[PDB]
């Protein structure tokens, strides 16, 4: 399950996943409707659902 970043996300709190617009993120736990958890650049962390889009 993959998504792609719609915007840069600059993390502010421990647990927040940093990424740039266009990056692909591997979704690991999307149980929360608001904040998904996944992996990018060799880290796990959480980020808002609405900062990404699902991809194929």
């Amino acid at each position: 399950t993959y998504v792609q970043a719609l915007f840069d996300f600059d993390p502010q709190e421990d647990g927040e996943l940093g990424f740039r617009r266009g990056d692909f993120i591997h979704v690991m736990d999307n149980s929360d409707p608001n904040w998904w958890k996944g992996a990018c650049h060799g880290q796990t962390g959480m980020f808002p659902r609405n900062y990404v889009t699902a991809v194929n």
Binding site: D8, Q12, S31, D32, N34, W35, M46, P48, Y51
Partner: peptide, 14 residues
């Protein structure tokens, strides 16, 4: 085009 507001009170670690 603008990034959405980030809603940290909704974070699942809270």
């Amino acid at each position: 085009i603008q990034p959405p507001p980030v809603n940290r009170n909704l974070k699942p670690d809270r």
